[PDB]
Amino acid sequence: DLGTGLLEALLRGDLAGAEALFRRGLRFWGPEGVLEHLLLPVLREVGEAWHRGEIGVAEEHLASTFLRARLQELLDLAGFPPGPPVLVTTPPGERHEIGAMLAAYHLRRKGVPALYLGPDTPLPDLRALARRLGAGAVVLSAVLSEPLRALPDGALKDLAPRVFLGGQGAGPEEARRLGAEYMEDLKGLAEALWL
Amino acid sequence: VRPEDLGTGLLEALLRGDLAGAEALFRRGLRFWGPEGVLEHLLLPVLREVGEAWHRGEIGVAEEHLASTFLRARLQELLDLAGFPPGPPVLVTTPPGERHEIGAMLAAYHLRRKGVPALYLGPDTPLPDLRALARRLGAGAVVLSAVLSEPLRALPDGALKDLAPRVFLGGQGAGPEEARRLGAEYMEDLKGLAEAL
Amino acid sequence: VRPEDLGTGLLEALLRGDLAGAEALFRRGLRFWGPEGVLEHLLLPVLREVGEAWHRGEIGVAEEHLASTFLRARLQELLDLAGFPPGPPVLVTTPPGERHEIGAMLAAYHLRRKGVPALYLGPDTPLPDLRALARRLGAGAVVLSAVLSEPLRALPDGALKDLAPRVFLGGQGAGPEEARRLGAEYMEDLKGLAEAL
Amino acid sequence: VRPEDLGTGLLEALLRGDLAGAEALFRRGLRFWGPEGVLEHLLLPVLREVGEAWHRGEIGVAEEHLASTFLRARLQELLDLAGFPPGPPVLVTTPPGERHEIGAMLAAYHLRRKGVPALYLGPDTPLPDLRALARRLGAGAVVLSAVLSEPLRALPDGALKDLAPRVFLGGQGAGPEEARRLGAEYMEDLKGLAEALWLPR
Ligand code: B12
Ligand code: B12
Ligand code: B12
Numbered sequence: 001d002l003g004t005g006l007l008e009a010l011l012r013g014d015l016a017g018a019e020a021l022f023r024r025g026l027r028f029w030g031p032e033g034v035l036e037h038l039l040l041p042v043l044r045e046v047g048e049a050w051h052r053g054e055i056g057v058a059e060e061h062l063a064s065t066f067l068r069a070r071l072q073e074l075l076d077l078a079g080f081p082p083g084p085p086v087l088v089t090t091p092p093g094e095r096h097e098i099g100a101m102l103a104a105y106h107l108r109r110k111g112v113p114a115l116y117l118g119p120d121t122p123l124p125d126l127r128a129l130a131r132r133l134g135a136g137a138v139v140l141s142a143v144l145s146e147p148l149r150a151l152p153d154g155a156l157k158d159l160a161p162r163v164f165l166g167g168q169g170a171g172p173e174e175a176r177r178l179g180a181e182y183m184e185d186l187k188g189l190a191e192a193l194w195l
Numbered sequence: 196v197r198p199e200d201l202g203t204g205l206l207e208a209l210l211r212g213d214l215a216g217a218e219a220l221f222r223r224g225l226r227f228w229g230p231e232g233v234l235e236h237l238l239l240p241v242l243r244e245v246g247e248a249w250h251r252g253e254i255g256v257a258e259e260h261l262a263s264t265f266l267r268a269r270l271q272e273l274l275d276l277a278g279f280p281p282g283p284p285v286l287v288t289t290p291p292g293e294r295h296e297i298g299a300m301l302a303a304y305h306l307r308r309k310g311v312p313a314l315y316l317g318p319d320t321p322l323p324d325l326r327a328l329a330r331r332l333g334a335g336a337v338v339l340s341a342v343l344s345e346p347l348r349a350l351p352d353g354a355l356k357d358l359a360p361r362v363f364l365g366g367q368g369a370g371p372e373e374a375r376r377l378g379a380e381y382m383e384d385l386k387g388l389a390e391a392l
Numbered sequence: 393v394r395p396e397d398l399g400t401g402l403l404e405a406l407l408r409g410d411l412a413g414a415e416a417l418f419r420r421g422l423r424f425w426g427p428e429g430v431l432e433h434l435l436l437p438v439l440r441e442v443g444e445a446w447h448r449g450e451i452g453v454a455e456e457h458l459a460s461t462f463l464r465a466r467l468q469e470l471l472d473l474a475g476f477p478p479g480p481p482v483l484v485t486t487p488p489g490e491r492h493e494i495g496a497m498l499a500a501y502h503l504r505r506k507g508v509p510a511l512y513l514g515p516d517t518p519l520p521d522l523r524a525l526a527r528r529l530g531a532g533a534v535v536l537s538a539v540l541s542e543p544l545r546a547l548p549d550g551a552l553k554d555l556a557p558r559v560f561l562g563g564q565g566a567g568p569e570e571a572r573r574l575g576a577e578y579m580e581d582l583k584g585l586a587e588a589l
Numbered sequence: 590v591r592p593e594d595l596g597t598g599l600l601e602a603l604l605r606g607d608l609a610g611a612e613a614l615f616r617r618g619l620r621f622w623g624p625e626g627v628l629e630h631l632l633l634p635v636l637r638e639v640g641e642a643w644h645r646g647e648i649g650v651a652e653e654h655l656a657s658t659f660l661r662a663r664l665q666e667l668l669d670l671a672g673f674p675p676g677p678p679v680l681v682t683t684p685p686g687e688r689h690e691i692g693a694m695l696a697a698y699h700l701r702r703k704g705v706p707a708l709y710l711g712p713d714t715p716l717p718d719l720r721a722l723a724r725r726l727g728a729g730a731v732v733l734s735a736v737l738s739e740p741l742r743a744l745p746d747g748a749l750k751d752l753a754p755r756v757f758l759g760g761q762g763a764g765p766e767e768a769r770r771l772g773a774e775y776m777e778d779l780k781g782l783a784e785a786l787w788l789p790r
């Protein structure tokens with residue numbers, strides 16, 4: 001797999017060769033393909049390696065900053081459609097960005113105007129922006145479960161006309177308790193908007 | 196349209212959630228002022244106005260996030276378009292506890308524009324891990340950007356002294372005294388940083 | 393619409409005089425393939441297709457001018473974004489009589505992407521003036537791109553030999569023997585050129 | 590650095606091969622004088638000073654090339670920022686044999702600033718190929734910039750006639766008589782050129 005190659009280039013600080021390997025993968029598998037076969041497998045392997053204590057925090061930072069940059073390029077290539085926006089973010093306390101960015105990307109690939117805000121947005125401020133921009137939906141990505149548990153019952157229900165929760169840190173019951181529609185796969189998300 | 200007006204236009208586009216218009220105005224600014232110029236005359240003035248507005252309680256966190264996430268994305272684009280030389284890298288990051296990342300990215304960018312192989316790691320790197328990577332890659336220098344002063348104050352004396360052969364601290368959160376205490380070379384302007392290396 | 397058809401789209405936009413559409417298509421390609429990629433998979437294939445069309449008598453020289461002026465402008469943008477390192481410069485140009493400038497610009501760009509301070513002079517520089525500037529600036533190398541062979545053939549033996557400490561000749565109009573005759577190092581690929589310095 | 594010193598500074602940076610410093614000084618000029626202003630107060634004065642220096646034998650051709658390639662790059666960015674209107678284009682170029690291209694770019698820029706879709710082709714376009722492109726694009730006008738007079742003199746009588754319904758020749762290398770001989774309207778000032786299209790006569 002180009003996965004091991006990509007990781008090894010990043011770990012030796014070869015950002016030029018890492019970029020070249022990613023670009024080859026994008027040319028070979030296309031935009032959706034490269035995410036499934038390269039970006040996510042590498043991100044998972046970086047996390048695992050760190051958990052095993054095989055790499056330190058600096059190396060993980062390097063890799064994650066790089067993958068985030070590639071995903072941002074893909075986001076930018078999808079363009080930004082006009083229309084009532086969908087705000088994409090993470091719950092308060094959640095700092096991980098890639099799951100939200102992936103969600104924004106899948107929406108944008110299907111012509112949905114997904115505004116990625118960045119992570120960790122307070123719920124009242126998110127509700128206020130959704131209202132001001134006449135947003136049709138809010139989408140939330142949770143990697144950790146703790147930030148969801150800290151939230152009062154029904155706290156996600158009124159953020160916008162539709163509210164979607166996904167990510168490892170989320171499950172059907174916590175979604176029900178919080179008042180959000182739970183969603184496992186990213187492909188289905190655009191269809192779930194009924195447009 | 197007018198160069199004299201791009202800051203206002205960019206801010207207004209971001210606040211109404213017009214990412215397409217924002218992108219077009221940034222591109223215009225890049226064409227007008229060039230790579231370094233757009234950062235001085237557009238990106239930073241807008242980022243500062245967003246931050247100020249938030250401090251005055253005029254805008255909420257969500258709006259500020261939108262704008263900052265956008266500006267960060269543009270600086271990353273510029274970073275990628277700059278040359279990356281081979282040779283002993285310079286690691287660029289922020290002190291432990293510092294989450295703001297634009298100042299570090301700006302530093303990496305100015306270095307890369309001047310032929311210095313600056314690896315931006317992202318923010319908030321533990322010092323032992325930073326030291327280990329600097330040693331493994333044979334880094335010639337470590338550059339740290341601090342916007343807040345608190346994260347610097349939490350560090351023990353001489354904590355930045357042996358990170359790499361040269362260690363640079365800058366950002367508004369830093370000053371010559373805190374640099375001396377922590378064992379880093381202070382610098383104020385990004386212009387001078389490439390010459391210093 | 394599919395990336396592998398950006399080439400035909402770009403060509404069609406240029407031929408109908410749609411500079412705005414051309415710019416948009418090029419930017420899409422840059423986002424898709426990145427800086428080096430867009431040159432390999434869009435700029436060069438389109439420039440070759442313009443040349444072929446001209447050979448088939450489908451378009452005149454004015455259309456070729458339009459397209460090449462456009463591509464030169466895109467390459468210039470990329471050149472500017474790579475930034476210009478300090479240090480002993482490398483002068484990049486074409487032999488006297490050679491007016492085509494894209495191969496030289498491509499060479500300058502690949503060098504600049506690798507931190508080498510490549511000064512693109514433009515095409516068609518007299519050899520005495522080139523030698524004088526190389527000496528005044530303490531240039532480490534001169535790089536020449538030749539598309540046509542005629543301008544090379546008009547030059548006396550050993551005419552490129554003392555232009556600077558290293559002298560490189562490339563381009564389809566050049567081969568190892570004409571390089572040897574003229575006193576330059578020949579190379580085929582732009583990738584190898586940075587390593588060679 | 591002060592505005593009254595930008596011209597000298599820019600030239601000196603270019604002559605020592607300091608492209609980074611040159612870029613920074615041009616941007617300072619843009620900040621001071623704005624887009625059109627920088628052309629009048631910085632770009633043209635520097636281009637003229639490069640020419641003068643070359644005449645006085647103080648710089649060779651290599652240095653002039655460096656400087657002109659730089660200024661052409663700046664002017665191209667300004668051209669692109671003027672935007673590209675829709676409609677029947679105006680082709681802008683130089684006569685065959687004319688290699689200087691700044692005058693043509695300046696003409697294209699003034700037209701584009703006034704909403705005219707000026708397509709800058711680059712310099713030195715053979716007249717039959719220019720005629721063919723004007724016809725293919727349905728161009729309403731062709732504009733030619735001549736710095737030198739010799740390339741005009743080499744052209745046969747009536748050689749610029751009917752390249753398009755309107756044909757304009759300008760530049761110091763051109764005069765009313767050579768225009769008449771070649772079958773073009775002569776024009777002195779760039780500002781008037783857009784109006785010269787809107788109201789025909
Ligand atoms: C990679 C990783 C990291 C990386 C993060 C890399 C990055 N993303 O920048 C690093 C090394 C930094 C890391 C550190 C930490 N993480 Co970690 N690490 C992982 C790992 C190996 C993979 C996580 C992952 O796949 N995330 C990527 C996202 C995109 O995938 P996902 O959230 O599963 O979501 C999928 C779908 O739901 C969909 N999706 C995502 N969002 C949305 C939204 C919608 C609406 C939809 C429809 C779909 C969707 O896309 C994804 C495709 O599969 C796991 C272990 C494992 N085996 O999974 C943990 C794990 C998530 N980490 C964990 C922990 C504890 C941490 C740390 C606290 C460790 C520490 N002590 O410092 C820190 C900080 C976490 C934080 N503060 O957020 C725990 C979580 C435990 C829990 N929450 O109950 C895990 C499970 C491992 C463990 N220790 O058991 N981690
Ligand atoms: C933008 C901003 C924010 C934004 C940040 C958005 C983002 N970037 O993500 C937001 C609203 C989120 C924010 C948040 C906070 N910030 Co604030 N806000 C600002 C502002 C406006 C900073 C401008 C900025 O980002 N500049 C970034 C870089 C470009 O600027 P710089 O560091 O001065 O860098 C220059 C040079 O130093 C050089 N440089 C940079 N790095 C290096 C390195 C080297 C080696 C060299 C040579 C040069 C160099 O490059 C730059 C050239 O212009 C200031 C007020 C102001 N007008 O400056 C505060 C300010 C920094 N914020 C402040 C505060 C208190 C906060 C918060 C704690 C608010 C809060 N109370 O919760 C939070 C932080 C949360 C946390 N991490 O703990 C204080 C900090 C006081 C201190 N220094 O300890 C400031 C100074 C406001 C004040 N009180 O006057 N803030
Ligand atoms: C495009 C083209 C032109 C264009 C140029 C404008 C344009 N570029 O679109 C125009 C219309 C001017 C043209 C016309 C002519 N050219 Co023509 N045309 C071509 C064509 C199709 C493309 C090749 C090309 O120009 N690439 C552009 C450059 C950048 O790429 P390159 O030169 O291959 O260089 C590569 C490498 O060498 C490297 N490189 C470049 N410089 C350097 C420097 C260094 C140091 C290094 C390491 C590497 C390096 O990078 C480049 C890309 O990888 C080829 C046919 C083909 N090859 O498919 C001919 C070709 C070059 N043309 C040819 C001919 C015949 C001509 C004319 C004489 C035609 C005529 N019959 O009158 C005229 C003369 C030009 C003039 N009158 O001023 C012949 C060359 C003669 C031969 N050796 O047999 C070719 C080979 C095709 C053929 N018919 O046989 N041409």
Ligand code: B12
Nearest residue numbers: 637640641657689690691692734758759760761776777778
């Ligand atoms: C710079 C310069 C050069 C530069 C050209 C710069 C470039 N573009 O690359 C260089 C050094 C290459 C050069 C070349 C030569 N040029 Co010279 N040099 C000059 C200089 C200083 C200015 C030329 C210039 O500014 N052109 C740029 C354009 C924008 O200026 P412009 O033509 O005045 O255009 C204005 C208007 O005409 C109008 N305009 C332009 N186009 C159009 C089109 C239309 C439709 C309209 C309405 C208006 C319009 O807009 C412009 C701004 O207001 C003059 C000296 C002087 N002016 O006193 C000579 C000068 C014109 N050059 C001269 C000539 C002919 C040459 C040379 C042949 C010198 C020689 N005798 O050996 C060389 C030839 C080398 C070559 N052919 O490549 C001599 C003429 C000698 C004589 N007749 O007595 C001059 C007059 C020097 C002098 N003071 O005597 N030159």
